[PDB]
Amino acid sequence: AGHMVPRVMRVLLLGDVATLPLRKVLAVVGTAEASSEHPLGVAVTKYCKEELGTETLGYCTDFQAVPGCGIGCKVSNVEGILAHSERPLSAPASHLNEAGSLPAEKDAVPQTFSVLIGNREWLRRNGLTISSDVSDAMTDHEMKGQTAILVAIDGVLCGMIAIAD
Secondary structure, X not given: OOOOOOOEEEXXXXXXXXXXXXXXXXXXXHHHHOOOOOOOHHHHHHHHHHHHOOOOOOOEEEEEEEOOOEEEEEEEOHHHHXXXXXXXXXXOOOOOOOOOOOOOOOOOXXXXXXXXXXXXXXXXXXXXXXXXXXXXXXXXXXXXXXXXEEEEEOOEEEEEEEEOO
């Protein structure tokens, strides 16, 4: 129909330190937030970053849209930063060799975080409270004036973004 991106109006807390530190989550959230994605969220994160006095940045994001669910994304790297590297430059080759066999095996995926975003109903149906229809009507209702978006971490409460043209 049309094409127009709104702007962020305000952010509300929807997380807790019962699952993880908001500081760390904010660090990653900021890494991706500043990574760009919203016509304001980036400036919001970058702004908070400037006010935080931390230019943190070194995470690997991986957004994706899921049907009959909503939106989602993953971020991992804090692990790599936690544990320095050791010259990540291998040379895989030579197989036909009579009896070579290169010692290339064993891999323990690092800690990866998944953040899901979408309508409150999505999160509700994901594994929250309140009725999906109730929350759905609420979220949709808001769309009749403003834009409401809920952000959950690993299907857990984290925070929601409120957009107001």
